């Protein structure tokens, strides 16, 4: 059922590898070979220089679910490879990097490079595990890539439906028209609210336990890129709130914290500040998440919601230039020298971004064991000051050369 495409510039070995993994055409589409302990389909995308590659990658991004990006080892990172790379940045679909005919392929921004040789198929098993690992996250409801998908989550009666209503009443919104999702544009940009139906549940059904509502909300997050955590300003914070937010975080989604029912709280300057501090103390792992106070009922500050979601989404998607990132790491190191761990002091040789949604970074080191979690936090903070990243978690992995 899953579909795999091979993308690269010409003379890299696409046809060899492709013919190797292709079984027979179906009736262009080929299914996978018999020798593979893996079931999937391939799509051929082959037949100016930048304009023909433009066609291929486009076709893959629409048709394929997982894309293999092929470069040439013996040559290396050619500027021609760097162009194809730039094209593929245009997709939220998974890309695995293959290096044919076989160390700053990391400096192409797709993470670990999988060496192969279409000779006696060396390295192919690792390549296919990476490719296949994505098959489970293949969305069931598929939207256009320009669409920004988000969900609202929070306990019974926080005002999810009401916040939605209030959002959709603004002059800037045009609502369209799975009978679970709501589509609309805002400043003519496309959005989908995941699983609005689930918010409108009772009225056809008695909720009798929360346990199914929880699990369904988890599937809505899996489907989103931004999660609005909505808290009741009147009744405060509870245990269930931490858990669902916990999941969102561990899943690497952008997060915005929404405090609804602000109208129903005794407000002076202090109460807002204390409620904010309260949230930072209960949700210690969400410091990157901004906090919006509003009221779905009075419409106070409700016009701040969509801008914040747009911003969290952008930061979730952001790609840094490597040169700037390395300036920033080395600046962090100068200001704050690295710790020892028994005679041996951590050294950082180089950093690259390996992926987006959420942004992830690899720093090449001395030895990964020497990098304390607290120093990791510190490097994360320095990257935040330099680039922004409000509204998204970020990941830093330490790896050894070599
Ligand atoms: N004071 C105040 N009350 C609100 C606000 N938003 C919603 N309410 C009230 O809270 C109750 C729940 O609103 P509702 O939109 O159904 O919350 P929900 O979370 O969508 C309901 P479910 O949990 O079933 O999905 C309603 O009585 C509504 O009038 C608000 O901003 N301020």
mmCIF file of C-alpha atoms in Angstrom, residues 15-384:
data_model
loop_
_atom_site.group_PDB
_atom_site.id
_atom_site.type_symbol
_atom_site.label_atom_id
_atom_site.label_comp_id
_atom_site.label_asym_id
_atom_site.label_seq_id
_atom_site.Cartn_x
_atom_site.Cartn_y
_atom_site.Cartn_z
ATOM 1 C CA UNK A 15 17.868 2.967 -12.367
ATOM 2 C CA UNK A 16 20.160 0.279 -10.886
ATOM 3 C CA UNK A 17 18.731 0.592 -7.329
ATOM 4 C CA UNK A 18 15.175 1.028 -8.633
ATOM 5 C CA UNK A 19 15.400 -2.094 -10.903
ATOM 6 C CA UNK A 20 16.817 -3.961 -7.936
ATOM 7 C CA UNK A 21 13.851 -3.098 -5.629
ATOM 8 C CA UNK A 22 11.139 -3.142 -8.316
ATOM 9 C CA UNK A 23 9.246 -6.373 -8.872
ATOM 10 C CA UNK A 24 6.534 -6.050 -11.506
ATOM 11 C CA UNK A 25 4.453 -3.184 -12.886
ATOM 12 C CA UNK A 26 0.812 -3.092 -11.817
ATOM 13 C CA UNK A 27 -2.106 -2.397 -14.230
ATOM 14 C CA UNK A 28 4.114 4.237 -13.655
ATOM 15 C CA UNK A 29 3.735 1.938 -10.670
ATOM 16 C CA UNK A 30 5.779 -1.143 -9.748
ATOM 17 C CA UNK A 31 5.366 -3.349 -6.714
ATOM 18 C CA UNK A 32 8.394 -4.412 -4.668
ATOM 19 C CA UNK A 33 10.531 -7.464 -5.369
ATOM 20 C CA UNK A 34 10.094 -10.970 -3.898
ATOM 21 C CA UNK A 35 13.377 -11.037 -2.086
ATOM 22 C CA UNK A 36 12.323 -8.097 0.072
ATOM 23 C CA UNK A 37 10.792 -9.033 3.421
ATOM 24 C CA UNK A 38 8.762 -5.843 2.793
ATOM 25 C CA UNK A 39 5.517 -5.027 0.959
ATOM 26 C CA UNK A 40 5.251 -1.723 -1.010
ATOM 27 C CA UNK A 41 4.942 -0.009 -4.408
ATOM 28 C CA UNK A 42 7.498 2.012 -6.373
ATOM 29 C CA UNK A 43 6.776 4.890 -8.712
ATOM 30 C CA UNK A 44 9.050 5.679 -11.681
ATOM 31 C CA UNK A 45 9.594 9.425 -12.055
ATOM 32 C CA UNK A 46 12.564 9.726 -14.521
ATOM 33 C CA UNK A 47 12.085 11.406 -17.919
ATOM 34 C CA UNK A 48 17.470 22.774 -19.086
ATOM 35 C CA UNK A 49 18.965 20.936 -16.075
ATOM 36 C CA UNK A 50 17.108 22.329 -12.991
ATOM 37 C CA UNK A 51 13.776 22.075 -14.819
ATOM 38 C CA UNK A 52 13.755 18.284 -15.365
ATOM 39 C CA UNK A 53 14.739 17.609 -11.744
ATOM 40 C CA UNK A 54 12.004 20.116 -10.819
ATOM 41 C CA UNK A 55 9.492 17.816 -12.556
ATOM 42 C CA UNK A 56 10.705 14.634 -10.853
ATOM 43 C CA UNK A 57 10.734 15.918 -7.264
ATOM 44 C CA UNK A 58 7.343 17.558 -7.761
ATOM 45 C CA UNK A 59 5.891 14.288 -8.977
ATOM 46 C CA UNK A 60 7.404 12.383 -6.042
ATOM 47 C CA UNK A 61 6.152 14.873 -3.436
ATOM 48 C CA UNK A 62 2.579 14.394 -4.665
ATOM 49 C CA UNK A 63 2.503 10.662 -5.363
ATOM 50 C CA UNK A 64 5.007 9.145 -2.945
ATOM 51 C CA UNK A 65 4.757 8.663 0.841
ATOM 52 C CA UNK A 66 8.481 8.125 1.424
ATOM 53 C CA UNK A 67 11.160 9.550 -0.808
ATOM 54 C CA UNK A 68 14.689 8.247 -1.192
ATOM 55 C CA UNK A 69 17.077 11.052 -2.120
ATOM 56 C CA UNK A 70 20.028 9.755 -4.085
ATOM 57 C CA UNK A 71 23.470 11.383 -4.332
ATOM 58 C CA UNK A 72 26.814 10.068 -5.711
ATOM 59 C CA UNK A 73 29.522 9.008 -3.252
ATOM 60 C CA UNK A 74 32.538 8.951 -5.615
ATOM 61 C CA UNK A 75 31.750 12.532 -6.657
ATOM 62 C CA UNK A 76 30.385 13.917 -3.367
ATOM 63 C CA UNK A 77 28.188 16.867 -2.538
ATOM 64 C CA UNK A 78 27.929 18.653 -5.887
ATOM 65 C CA UNK A 79 26.144 22.001 -6.161
ATOM 66 C CA UNK A 80 23.754 20.038 -8.407
ATOM 67 C CA UNK A 81 22.890 17.904 -5.364
ATOM 68 C CA UNK A 82 22.468 21.066 -3.250
ATOM 69 C CA UNK A 83 19.790 22.271 -5.683
ATOM 70 C CA UNK A 84 17.692 19.071 -5.545
ATOM 71 C CA UNK A 85 17.996 19.320 -1.758
ATOM 72 C CA UNK A 86 16.548 22.837 -1.856
ATOM 73 C CA UNK A 87 13.577 21.521 -3.837
ATOM 74 C CA UNK A 88 12.817 18.750 -1.305
ATOM 75 C CA UNK A 89 12.748 21.195 1.598
ATOM 76 C CA UNK A 90 9.310 21.928 0.135
ATOM 77 C CA UNK A 91 7.727 18.825 1.691
ATOM 78 C CA UNK A 92 6.590 17.503 5.096
ATOM 79 C CA UNK A 93 6.786 13.940 3.682
ATOM 80 C CA UNK A 94 9.744 11.781 4.837
ATOM 81 C CA UNK A 95 13.012 11.804 2.905
ATOM 82 C CA UNK A 96 15.788 9.258 3.477
ATOM 83 C CA UNK A 97 19.247 10.050 2.059
ATOM 84 C CA UNK A 98 21.051 7.378 0.042
ATOM 85 C CA UNK A 99 24.713 7.579 -0.898
ATOM 86 C CA UNK A 100 25.445 5.405 -3.972
ATOM 87 C CA UNK A 101 28.741 3.796 -5.086
ATOM 88 C CA UNK A 102 30.429 3.489 -1.650
ATOM 89 C CA UNK A 103 30.766 12.832 5.643
ATOM 90 C CA UNK A 104 29.070 16.166 5.115
ATOM 91 C CA UNK A 105 26.047 14.700 3.471
ATOM 92 C CA UNK A 106 24.762 15.562 6.911
ATOM 93 C CA UNK A 107 25.306 19.018 5.359
ATOM 94 C CA UNK A 108 22.397 18.437 3.012
ATOM 95 C CA UNK A 109 20.024 18.500 5.947
ATOM 96 C CA UNK A 110 18.305 15.072 5.825
ATOM 97 C CA UNK A 111 20.169 13.422 8.653
ATOM 98 C CA UNK A 112 21.971 10.088 8.559
ATOM 99 C CA UNK A 113 23.335 9.188 5.062
ATOM 100 C CA UNK A 114 22.857 5.543 4.080
ATOM 101 C CA UNK A 115 25.792 4.249 2.088
ATOM 102 C CA UNK A 116 24.870 1.757 -0.615
ATOM 103 C CA UNK A 117 26.478 0.088 -3.655
ATOM 104 C CA UNK A 118 24.095 -1.156 -6.377
ATOM 105 C CA UNK A 119 26.758 -3.810 -7.023
ATOM 106 C CA UNK A 120 26.205 -6.598 -4.526
ATOM 107 C CA UNK A 121 23.509 -4.591 -2.801
ATOM 108 C CA UNK A 122 25.611 -3.632 0.229
ATOM 109 C CA UNK A 123 23.842 -1.317 2.640
ATOM 110 C CA UNK A 124 20.392 -1.960 1.128
ATOM 111 C CA UNK A 125 18.968 -3.634 4.219
ATOM 112 C CA UNK A 126 19.675 -0.584 6.386
ATOM 113 C CA UNK A 127 18.253 1.749 3.737
ATOM 114 C CA UNK A 128 14.995 -0.240 3.605
ATOM 115 C CA UNK A 129 14.599 -0.317 7.381
ATOM 116 C CA UNK A 130 14.874 3.477 7.453
ATOM 117 C CA UNK A 131 12.361 3.736 4.555
ATOM 118 C CA UNK A 132 9.920 1.178 6.038
ATOM 119 C CA UNK A 133 10.062 2.702 9.542
ATOM 120 C CA UNK A 134 7.992 5.618 8.198
ATOM 121 C CA UNK A 135 5.136 3.432 6.899
ATOM 122 C CA UNK A 136 3.231 3.470 10.188
ATOM 123 C CA UNK A 137 3.110 7.316 10.351
ATOM 124 C CA UNK A 138 1.521 7.478 6.857
ATOM 125 C CA UNK A 139 -1.553 9.700 7.266
ATOM 126 C CA UNK A 140 -4.996 8.130 6.619
ATOM 127 C CA UNK A 141 -6.659 11.497 5.784
ATOM 128 C CA UNK A 142 -4.381 13.240 3.309
ATOM 129 C CA UNK A 143 -4.355 16.967 2.710
ATOM 130 C CA UNK A 144 -2.589 19.379 0.403
ATOM 131 C CA UNK A 145 0.935 20.286 1.643
ATOM 132 C CA UNK A 146 0.117 24.053 1.957
ATOM 133 C CA UNK A 147 -2.609 23.189 4.565
ATOM 134 C CA UNK A 148 -1.653 23.862 8.201
ATOM 135 C CA UNK A 149 -3.219 21.290 10.512
ATOM 136 C CA UNK A 150 -3.894 21.850 14.193
ATOM 137 C CA UNK A 151 -6.044 20.614 17.102
ATOM 138 C CA UNK A 152 -7.438 21.966 20.365
ATOM 139 C CA UNK A 153 -7.193 19.708 23.388
ATOM 140 C CA UNK A 154 -8.321 20.179 27.006
ATOM 141 C CA UNK A 155 -10.691 18.709 29.593
ATOM 142 C CA UNK A 156 -14.513 18.500 29.391
ATOM 143 C CA UNK A 157 -16.244 21.903 29.137
ATOM 144 C CA UNK A 158 -13.141 24.170 28.775
ATOM 145 C CA UNK A 159 -14.755 25.763 25.744
ATOM 146 C CA UNK A 160 -13.073 24.035 22.782
ATOM 147 C CA UNK A 161 -16.192 24.315 20.563
ATOM 148 C CA UNK A 162 -16.795 27.861 21.745
ATOM 149 C CA UNK A 163 -13.178 28.913 20.979
ATOM 150 C CA UNK A 164 -13.607 27.429 17.509
ATOM 151 C CA UNK A 165 -16.868 29.303 16.976
ATOM 152 C CA UNK A 166 -15.335 32.567 18.079
ATOM 153 C CA UNK A 167 -12.261 32.045 15.873
ATOM 154 C CA UNK A 168 -14.393 31.346 12.761
ATOM 155 C CA UNK A 169 -16.492 34.524 13.275
ATOM 156 C CA UNK A 170 -13.636 36.932 12.488
ATOM 157 C CA UNK A 171 -13.779 39.007 9.281
ATOM 158 C CA UNK A 172 -10.426 37.479 8.225
ATOM 159 C CA UNK A 173 -11.860 33.886 8.051
ATOM 160 C CA UNK A 174 -13.734 32.144 5.231
ATOM 161 C CA UNK A 175 -15.063 28.744 6.299
ATOM 162 C CA UNK A 176 -15.272 26.077 3.574
ATOM 163 C CA UNK A 177 -18.755 24.802 2.561
ATOM 164 C CA UNK A 178 -14.020 12.775 6.612
ATOM 165 C CA UNK A 179 -16.901 14.532 8.386
ATOM 166 C CA UNK A 180 -14.534 15.091 11.346
ATOM 167 C CA UNK A 181 -12.306 17.933 10.217
ATOM 168 C CA UNK A 182 -13.092 21.658 9.689
ATOM 169 C CA UNK A 183 -11.413 23.565 6.795
ATOM 170 C CA UNK A 184 -11.140 27.319 6.459
ATOM 171 C CA UNK A 185 -8.830 30.032 5.209
ATOM 172 C CA UNK A 186 -7.434 32.912 7.308
ATOM 173 C CA UNK A 187 -5.842 35.764 5.396
ATOM 174 C CA UNK A 188 -6.447 33.286 2.527
ATOM 175 C CA UNK A 189 -4.086 30.674 4.032
ATOM 176 C CA UNK A 190 -5.584 27.143 4.323
ATOM 177 C CA UNK A 191 -6.140 25.435 7.695
ATOM 178 C CA UNK A 192 -7.741 22.252 8.949
ATOM 179 C CA UNK A 193 -8.851 21.851 12.570
ATOM 180 C CA UNK A 194 -8.380 18.134 13.227
ATOM 181 C CA UNK A 195 -11.422 16.265 14.645
ATOM 182 C CA UNK A 196 -13.914 19.028 15.427
ATOM 183 C CA UNK A 197 -16.563 16.227 15.455
ATOM 184 C CA UNK A 198 -14.937 14.725 18.565
ATOM 185 C CA UNK A 199 -15.434 18.034 20.378
ATOM 186 C CA UNK A 200 -19.160 17.933 19.416
ATOM 187 C CA UNK A 201 -19.577 14.394 20.825
ATOM 188 C CA UNK A 202 -22.216 14.561 23.582
ATOM 189 C CA UNK A 203 -25.612 15.518 22.218
ATOM 190 C CA UNK A 204 -25.569 12.158 20.452
ATOM 191 C CA UNK A 205 -23.740 10.154 23.154
ATOM 192 C CA UNK A 206 -23.286 9.969 26.926
ATOM 193 C CA UNK A 207 -19.659 10.301 27.929
ATOM 194 C CA UNK A 208 -19.457 7.720 30.771
ATOM 195 C CA UNK A 209 -15.667 7.519 31.172
ATOM 196 C CA UNK A 210 -12.872 9.779 29.928
ATOM 197 C CA UNK A 211 -10.541 6.985 28.828
ATOM 198 C CA UNK A 212 -11.810 6.831 25.232
ATOM 199 C CA UNK A 213 -11.957 10.600 24.926
ATOM 200 C CA UNK A 214 -8.316 10.709 26.005
ATOM 201 C CA UNK A 215 -7.204 8.106 23.462
ATOM 202 C CA UNK A 216 -9.120 9.791 20.634
ATOM 203 C CA UNK A 217 -7.489 13.157 21.498
ATOM 204 C CA UNK A 218 -4.113 11.398 21.219
ATOM 205 C CA UNK A 219 -4.948 10.391 17.613
ATOM 206 C CA UNK A 220 -5.885 14.005 16.899
ATOM 207 C CA UNK A 221 -2.459 15.188 18.064
ATOM 208 C CA UNK A 222 -0.704 12.522 15.937
ATOM 209 C CA UNK A 223 -2.612 14.083 13.031
ATOM 210 C CA UNK A 224 -1.684 17.730 13.909
ATOM 211 C CA UNK A 225 1.491 19.771 13.632
ATOM 212 C CA UNK A 226 0.368 22.427 16.200
ATOM 213 C CA UNK A 227 -1.512 21.573 19.417
ATOM 214 C CA UNK A 228 -3.429 24.238 21.318
ATOM 215 C CA UNK A 229 -3.514 23.137 24.985
ATOM 216 C CA UNK A 230 -6.581 24.817 26.438
ATOM 217 C CA UNK A 231 -6.826 25.445 30.171
ATOM 218 C CA UNK A 232 -9.789 26.586 32.206
ATOM 219 C CA UNK A 233 -8.908 29.902 33.829
ATOM 220 C CA UNK A 234 -11.754 29.525 36.321
ATOM 221 C CA UNK A 235 -11.218 25.956 37.587
ATOM 222 C CA UNK A 236 -7.393 25.881 37.204
ATOM 223 C CA UNK A 237 -5.013 23.060 36.264
ATOM 224 C CA UNK A 238 -5.502 19.287 36.792
ATOM 225 C CA UNK A 239 -3.546 15.998 36.406
ATOM 226 C CA UNK A 240 -5.087 14.962 33.078
ATOM 227 C CA UNK A 241 -3.906 18.319 31.605
ATOM 228 C CA UNK A 242 -0.233 17.510 32.225
ATOM 229 C CA UNK A 243 -0.485 14.053 30.647
ATOM 230 C CA UNK A 244 -1.977 15.077 27.295
ATOM 231 C CA UNK A 245 0.417 18.013 26.992
ATOM 232 C CA UNK A 246 3.133 15.525 28.028
ATOM 233 C CA UNK A 247 2.247 13.374 25.007
ATOM 234 C CA UNK A 248 2.210 16.353 22.620
ATOM 235 C CA UNK A 249 5.681 17.386 23.741
ATOM 236 C CA UNK A 250 7.097 13.865 23.540
ATOM 237 C CA UNK A 251 5.630 13.740 20.065
ATOM 238 C CA UNK A 252 7.500 16.877 18.897
ATOM 239 C CA UNK A 253 4.489 19.039 18.014
ATOM 240 C CA UNK A 254 4.380 22.800 18.257
ATOM 241 C CA UNK A 255 2.397 23.872 21.329
ATOM 242 C CA UNK A 256 0.451 26.946 22.294
ATOM 243 C CA UNK A 257 -1.089 27.212 25.744
ATOM 244 C CA UNK A 258 -4.548 28.786 25.799
ATOM 245 C CA UNK A 259 -6.188 29.987 29.025
ATOM 246 C CA UNK A 260 -9.932 30.358 28.309
ATOM 247 C CA UNK A 261 -12.677 31.861 30.547
ATOM 248 C CA UNK A 262 -10.481 34.824 31.390
ATOM 249 C CA UNK A 263 -13.686 36.882 31.746
ATOM 250 C CA UNK A 264 -14.706 34.764 34.763
ATOM 251 C CA UNK A 265 -11.627 35.473 36.929
ATOM 252 C CA UNK A 266 -11.039 38.427 39.315
ATOM 253 C CA UNK A 267 -8.512 40.316 37.200
ATOM 254 C CA UNK A 268 -5.903 42.899 38.126
ATOM 255 C CA UNK A 269 -2.208 42.946 37.105
ATOM 256 C CA UNK A 270 -1.155 40.268 39.578
ATOM 257 C CA UNK A 271 -3.594 37.413 38.692
ATOM 258 C CA UNK A 272 -2.344 37.083 35.104
ATOM 259 C CA UNK A 273 1.285 36.984 36.260
ATOM 260 C CA UNK A 274 0.570 34.337 38.925
ATOM 261 C CA UNK A 275 -1.435 32.136 36.579
ATOM 262 C CA UNK A 276 1.418 32.296 34.064
ATOM 263 C CA UNK A 277 3.946 31.326 36.802
ATOM 264 C CA UNK A 278 1.604 28.625 37.858
ATOM 265 C CA UNK A 279 1.647 27.131 34.310
ATOM 266 C CA UNK A 280 5.463 27.303 34.059
ATOM 267 C CA UNK A 281 5.651 25.401 37.366
ATOM 268 C CA UNK A 282 3.196 22.669 36.368
ATOM 269 C CA UNK A 283 4.334 22.424 32.728
ATOM 270 C CA UNK A 284 8.073 22.701 33.205
ATOM 271 C CA UNK A 285 8.735 20.968 29.899
ATOM 272 C CA UNK A 286 6.774 23.571 27.902
ATOM 273 C CA UNK A 287 8.795 26.760 28.409
ATOM 274 C CA UNK A 288 8.954 27.350 24.680
ATOM 275 C CA UNK A 289 5.094 27.455 24.559
ATOM 276 C CA UNK A 290 3.552 30.914 24.670
ATOM 277 C CA UNK A 291 0.556 31.665 26.900
ATOM 278 C CA UNK A 292 -2.546 33.399 25.645
ATOM 279 C CA UNK A 293 -5.300 34.579 27.941
ATOM 280 C CA UNK A 294 -8.665 34.999 26.189
ATOM 281 C CA UNK A 295 -12.460 34.553 26.402
ATOM 282 C CA UNK A 296 -14.517 32.643 23.820
ATOM 283 C CA UNK A 297 -17.601 34.221 25.355
ATOM 284 C CA UNK A 298 -16.605 37.922 25.314
ATOM 285 C CA UNK A 299 -14.213 37.520 22.323
ATOM 286 C CA UNK A 300 -11.472 39.279 24.349
ATOM 287 C CA UNK A 301 -8.077 38.651 22.746
ATOM 288 C CA UNK A 302 -9.454 35.839 20.585
ATOM 289 C CA UNK A 303 -7.890 37.578 17.528
ATOM 290 C CA UNK A 304 -4.505 36.589 18.983
ATOM 291 C CA UNK A 305 -5.097 32.846 18.552
ATOM 292 C CA UNK A 306 -4.517 32.326 14.771
ATOM 293 C CA UNK A 307 -1.472 34.568 14.639
ATOM 294 C CA UNK A 308 0.109 32.446 17.457
ATOM 295 C CA UNK A 309 -0.753 29.205 15.698
ATOM 296 C CA UNK A 310 0.730 30.540 12.450
ATOM 297 C CA UNK A 311 3.881 31.516 14.330
ATOM 298 C CA UNK A 312 4.243 28.155 16.159
ATOM 299 C CA UNK A 313 3.796 26.378 12.791
ATOM 300 C CA UNK A 314 6.474 28.482 11.094
ATOM 301 C CA UNK A 315 8.981 27.858 13.905
ATOM 302 C CA UNK A 316 8.117 24.101 13.789
ATOM 303 C CA UNK A 317 9.140 24.176 10.128
ATOM 304 C CA UNK A 318 12.243 26.402 10.268
ATOM 305 C CA UNK A 319 15.596 25.547 8.623
ATOM 306 C CA UNK A 320 18.693 27.272 9.804
ATOM 307 C CA UNK A 321 21.760 28.015 7.687
ATOM 308 C CA UNK A 322 24.618 25.778 8.802
ATOM 309 C CA UNK A 323 27.169 28.612 8.852
ATOM 310 C CA UNK A 324 25.122 30.655 11.340
ATOM 311 C CA UNK A 325 24.376 27.615 13.524
ATOM 312 C CA UNK A 326 28.081 26.887 13.839
ATOM 313 C CA UNK A 327 28.880 30.452 14.698
ATOM 314 C CA UNK A 328 26.194 30.113 17.456
ATOM 315 C CA UNK A 329 27.475 26.811 18.913
ATOM 316 C CA UNK A 330 31.081 28.101 18.975
ATOM 317 C CA UNK A 331 29.787 31.306 20.570
ATOM 318 C CA UNK A 332 28.003 29.251 23.184
ATOM 319 C CA UNK A 333 31.223 27.305 23.853
ATOM 320 C CA UNK A 334 33.405 30.449 24.230
ATOM 321 C CA UNK A 335 30.981 32.004 26.724
ATOM 322 C CA UNK A 336 30.682 28.754 28.648
ATOM 323 C CA UNK A 337 33.507 26.172 28.351
ATOM 324 C CA UNK A 338 32.631 22.522 28.205
ATOM 325 C CA UNK A 339 32.765 20.282 31.278
ATOM 326 C CA UNK A 340 35.199 17.417 32.052
ATOM 327 C CA UNK A 341 33.982 13.876 33.043
ATOM 328 C CA UNK A 342 37.180 12.277 34.439
ATOM 329 C CA UNK A 343 40.264 13.925 32.908
ATOM 330 C CA UNK A 344 38.608 14.281 29.479
ATOM 331 C CA UNK A 345 36.904 17.516 28.347
ATOM 332 C CA UNK A 346 34.031 17.437 25.771
ATOM 333 C CA UNK A 347 34.890 18.821 22.342
ATOM 334 C CA UNK A 348 32.344 19.941 19.728
ATOM 335 C CA UNK A 349 33.622 19.716 16.147
ATOM 336 C CA UNK A 350 30.583 20.706 14.102
ATOM 337 C CA UNK A 351 26.757 21.013 14.168
ATOM 338 C CA UNK A 352 24.127 20.524 11.507
ATOM 339 C CA UNK A 353 20.322 20.547 11.310
ATOM 340 C CA UNK A 354 19.110 17.056 10.383
ATOM 341 C CA UNK A 355 15.340 17.577 10.141
ATOM 342 C CA UNK A 356 12.230 19.693 10.778
ATOM 343 C CA UNK A 357 8.811 19.365 12.436
ATOM 344 C CA UNK A 358 10.299 19.525 15.017
ATOM 345 C CA UNK A 359 13.693 21.081 14.325
ATOM 346 C CA UNK A 360 16.504 18.608 15.175
ATOM 347 C CA UNK A 361 20.210 19.120 15.396
ATOM 348 C CA UNK A 362 23.253 16.854 15.504
ATOM 349 C CA UNK A 363 26.456 18.086 17.130
ATOM 350 C CA UNK A 364 29.558 16.048 16.287
ATOM 351 C CA UNK A 365 31.723 15.523 19.266
ATOM 352 C CA UNK A 366 34.698 14.010 20.922
ATOM 353 C CA UNK A 367 32.544 11.330 22.609
ATOM 354 C CA UNK A 368 28.730 11.545 23.107
ATOM 355 C CA UNK A 369 28.866 10.230 26.711
ATOM 356 C CA UNK A 370 30.685 13.420 27.844
ATOM 357 C CA UNK A 371 27.746 15.688 26.966
ATOM 358 C CA UNK A 372 25.724 16.267 30.132
ATOM 359 C CA UNK A 373 22.009 16.897 29.766
ATOM 360 C CA UNK A 374 22.473 20.320 31.467
ATOM 361 C CA UNK A 375 24.981 21.353 28.797
ATOM 362 C CA UNK A 376 22.494 20.091 26.246
ATOM 363 C CA UNK A 377 19.860 22.418 27.813
ATOM 364 C CA UNK A 378 22.373 25.239 27.604
ATOM 365 C CA UNK A 379 23.096 24.650 23.921
ATOM 366 C CA UNK A 380 19.338 24.562 23.298
ATOM 367 C CA UNK A 381 18.865 27.862 25.066
ATOM 368 C CA UNK A 382 21.608 29.531 22.991
ATOM 369 C CA UNK A 383 20.083 28.307 19.739
ATOM 370 C CA UNK A 384 16.728 29.733 20.930
#
